Symmetry: none
Subunit: 90 residues, 12 copies
Amino acid sequence: TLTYLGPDTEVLGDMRAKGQVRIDGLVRGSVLVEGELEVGPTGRVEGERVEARSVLIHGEVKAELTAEKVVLSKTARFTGQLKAQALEVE
Amino acid sequence: TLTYLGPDTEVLGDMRAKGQVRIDGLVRGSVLVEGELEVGPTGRVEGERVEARSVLIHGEVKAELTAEKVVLSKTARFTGQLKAQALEVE
Amino acid sequence: TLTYLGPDTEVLGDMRAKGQVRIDGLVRGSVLVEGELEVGPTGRVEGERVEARSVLIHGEVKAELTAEKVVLSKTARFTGQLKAQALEVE
Amino acid sequence: TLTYLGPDTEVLGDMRAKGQVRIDGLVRGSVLVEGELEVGPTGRVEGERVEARSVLIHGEVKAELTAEKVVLSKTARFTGQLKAQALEVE
Amino acid sequence: TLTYLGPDTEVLGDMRAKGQVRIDGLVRGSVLVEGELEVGPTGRVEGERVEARSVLIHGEVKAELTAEKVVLSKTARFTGQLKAQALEVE
Amino acid sequence: TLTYLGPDTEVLGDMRAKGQVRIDGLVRGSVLVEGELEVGPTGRVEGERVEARSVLIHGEVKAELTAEKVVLSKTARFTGQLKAQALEVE
Amino acid sequence: TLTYLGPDTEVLGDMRAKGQVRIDGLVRGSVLVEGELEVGPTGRVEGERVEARSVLIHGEVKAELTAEKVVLSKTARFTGQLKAQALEVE
Amino acid sequence: TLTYLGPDTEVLGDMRAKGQVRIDGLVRGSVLVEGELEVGPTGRVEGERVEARSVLIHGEVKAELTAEKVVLSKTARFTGQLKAQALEVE
Amino acid sequence: TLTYLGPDTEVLGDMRAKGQVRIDGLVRGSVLVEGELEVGPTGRVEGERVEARSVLIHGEVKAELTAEKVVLSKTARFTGQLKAQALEVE
Amino acid sequence: TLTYLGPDTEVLGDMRAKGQVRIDGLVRGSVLVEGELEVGPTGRVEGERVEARSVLIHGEVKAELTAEKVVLSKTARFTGQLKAQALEVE
Amino acid sequence: TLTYLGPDTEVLGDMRAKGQVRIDGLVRGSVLVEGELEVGPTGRVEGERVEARSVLIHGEVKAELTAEKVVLSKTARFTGQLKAQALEVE
Amino acid sequence: TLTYLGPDTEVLGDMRAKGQVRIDGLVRGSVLVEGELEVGPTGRVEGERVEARSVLIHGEVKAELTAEKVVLSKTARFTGQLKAQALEVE
C-alpha cells in the first residue's frame, strides 16, 4: 500500500486508490483515494474530482478537491473549487 | 483608502469595503471587499461569505470564500468552501 | 492600535473596538470603543448607541451618544440623544 | 418681544417665556421658551430643563436640553442631557 | 444693562438684578434690583419683597415695596405694605 | 356728619372721628376716622397714624397709612409706611 | 371756610382755626378761632383756652373764654373764667 | 333779710350785704352779698366786684362777677370778667 | 317802691332814693330820699347829709338831718345838725 | 521512477508510463509503458493494448500484448493476441 | 490416434493431423492438429501457423499460435503471434 | 524412438527420420528413414523417394523405393521404381 507515481507517468482516466499515494506525474480524471495523499513538486492533477481524508500538495491541482485536512508548501498551486475543514500551511 | 482594523476591534456585522484592507481583529459576518484584503496573524474572520479580487492570509477564516487570487502564509488556518482561480503560497 | 476606516467602507453591524479610532465612512449600528474616537468630514454613523471616553466629530452621527468629552468642528451635524459631561467646540 | 437678561441679572426660579429670549447672566431653574433662545458668552443657565425650538449658545449650560435646532459657537460649553433633532455649529 | 421682560414672560422665582429693569409680564417672587425698576401696564409682580432705589409702576404689584422714590400712573393698582420716602404721581 | 376742616384750620392733636371727613388744612397727629376720609390739595396730615376704611388724597400725608381703599390724584404726596389692600389712582 | 366738627369727632389737641367754626362734638384742648365760633347742643369744648371775636353756645364749654360778643341759649352750660365785653342771651 | 332796692334807688358806693338781695336800681361800686343775689330787668350794677353764692340776672352788670351759680334771662346783659362754676340760662 | 334795707346790710356810699325807705342796717354816707324815710331800731345812718320829706327814727343818725316833719321814738338817738319844721315824738 | 501500484489501486483509464512499473492491483484500459513492466500475483491488466520492451507477469492480462521479451510465472494467466519476439518462462 | 514424432524426425512440410499429437522433433511448416498438441523438450516447430484446441510446449515454436488453452513449462521458448483464450504455466 | 503416424495424420512434406517408423496415414512427399519402416493397411506413401534399410508394406506406396530388405503382405500395393536386394512376402 505504498503507491507511487510519476514523473512522466501520464494517465488519462479515473484512479480510485486506498492507503498511501504519492504523485509526481500527470493525471487527467478523478482521484478518489481513501487515505493519505501526497502531490510532489512535479505533479499535475487536472480533472473533476479529488476526494481524500488528508491531502498534501507540492504541485498543481485543477479539480474539485474535497477532503478534511489540506496541507500546502511554497511550491503548491491550485485552481478551482475546494471543500476542506482545516487548511494549514508549512 | 487604507482601511485597517484590529486588534481588539471586534465587529458584529457584514463589512463591505473597497480598496486595500488589513485586518488584525475579529469579524463575525460577511466581507465583500472589492479590492485587496490582508488578514494579519491575530485576525479571525468567521461568517458566511468572503468575496474579493486578492486575498493574503495569516490568520483564521471560516466562511464561503470566492475570489480570484489567494495568497497564504505559514500561520494560516481555513475552514469551508473556496472558489478561486489561483491559490499560491508566499 | 492605529485603527482607521472610511470612506466607502460601509458596515451593517455593531463595531465594538478599543484604543483609538478614526472613521471617515458609513456605519449602520453601534460603536463601543474604549478610548478615543474620531469622525471625519465624510463620516456617517447612524444607529442606536455610540459610547466612548473621548469623541471628536467632523461628520454626521445619529444615535444615542454617551461619552465624557465631546468635541465638534464646523462640518459637524448631529441628531438624537447626547449625554456628556463636558461639551467643547474646536 | 425683545426679552433680554444679564449680566448681573441672576434669577432663582423657572422662566417660562415666549418669543425671543437672550441671556447674558445667570439663571438657576427651568427654561421653557416657546421660540428662539440666545445665550451670551457671559450667560449661565444651570438647572434641570431647557425647552425651545431654537437655541443659540455662547456660554455655559448645565441642564436637560430638549429642542429641535441647536447652534453652538467656539465659546460654548454644555453638560448634561441633550435631545435634539438638528445639532449644528456656527 | 437694558434688562427687559414681558409680556408672556412669566418667571417663577426671585430676581436679583442691577441697573435698569422693566417688566411687562408676570413675576412671582421677590425682586431686589439695585437701581431703577419699571413695571409696564401689563406687568404684575406678586410675592414677598420689592427693593430698589426707584420704582415706576403701571401695573399690579402685591408685595412689600421698599424704595426711596416711587412713581405711579393711572393704570396701577398696588396691594400690600409700602415703605418709601417719596411717593409721587406722574 | 359733614366733618370738614381747612384751610387755615391747624390742629395740634389726634383727631378720632366717625363718618366722613375732608381736610384742606394742617393736622399734626393721628387721624382715626371710622369711614371715608378725604384730603384736599392744600391739606397736610403729618404724624404717626392714619386709619380709615377709605382714604382719598390730594395733599401731603407723612404717617403710617392703614386703610382698605386708597385713591390718589396728580397732586398727591406721601412719605412713610402704607398698608392698604387696594391702592388705586384717579 | 365753613369749618364744622362733630358729633363723634373727638379731637385730643389744640385747634387753631380762622374764619367760622361750628362744633357739635367733643374737643379736649384750646380753641383759637379768628372769627365767629358756634358750639352745638351736642357740643363739648373742655380744655384750657377759648379765644374768638364771637362765640355762640348751645353746648358745654369749660375753659378761659375771652371774646368780644358771647351769646348763650337755653341748652348752654359754661364753667370757668369768662372775660367778655358783651354777654347776651337768646 | 328781705333786702330790696330799686327802682330810682341809685347808690354811689359799696353795698356789702348778707342773706337775700334783689336790685332794681343803679349801684356804682362793689356788691358782696353772702347769699342769693337778684337783679331785676330794670337793674344796673356797674363797678368793680360782684360776689355771691347765687346770682340771678335780668338787668345790666359791668363788674368782675365771681359766684358758683349764675342764672340769666332774655333781658340780661353783662360786660367784664366772670369766674363761675355753673353758668345756666332760664 | 318799698325800698328796704337791713339788718346786716351795711352800705359804704351815698344812697339816693325816691319814695318810701326803711333802713335796719348801716349807711356810711348821705341819704337823700324824696319821700318818707324810716330807720328801724337796728338802723344806723352816719355820714354827711340826710334830707327827706318825712323821717321816723328808731335807730341812730349822725348827720345833718333836714326835713319838714321828723318823728322820734323811745329807742331813737341823734347827733348833729337838724333843720325841721315839726319835730314830734312817738 | 520505481512506479508501483496496487493492491486496491483501481484505475479506469489508459496509463502511459516510462521506466519500471510493478502492478499488484487492477487496471482497466491501455498500458503503453516505455520500459520494463511487472504484474504481481494480485495484478490484473484488462483493456485493449499493452506495449513495452519487457514484460514480467504473475497475474492476469486480457489485452493485445506487444513486447520483445515476455516472462511468466506459475500464477500467471493470459487471454488475447500476443505479438512478441521471445516468450520464456521463469 | 496417438501420433508421436521425434527426436531426429525432421519433416519439411505441413502436417495436418486429427486427434492427439506429440512432437519431440523438428517441423518446418504449418501444423493443424484438431485436438491436443504436445511439444517435447527436444521439439522445434518453425513455420507459419499452428492451430489446435490445446497446445502444451516444452520446446521452441516460431509461428502464429492459435488455440484455446496454452500451457508452458520451464524449458519452453516461443517467438511470434499467439491467439489463445487461457495462457497458463506448469 | 517409436515414430508413428496415421490414420487421419495427413502430411504435405518430406519426412526424414531415423530409427523406426510406422505409418498408417497419408504422406505426399519423400520419406528418408534411416532404419526399419512400416506402412499400415490404411497407409499411403506417394511421392518421389522412399529410402530405408528395411521396408514392410501393408498399404499403398507410389515412389522410387530403395532399400535392402522389402516385405509385403496380402493387402499391399506398389507402383513405380523399386531397388531392393531381397524382396520377400509375408
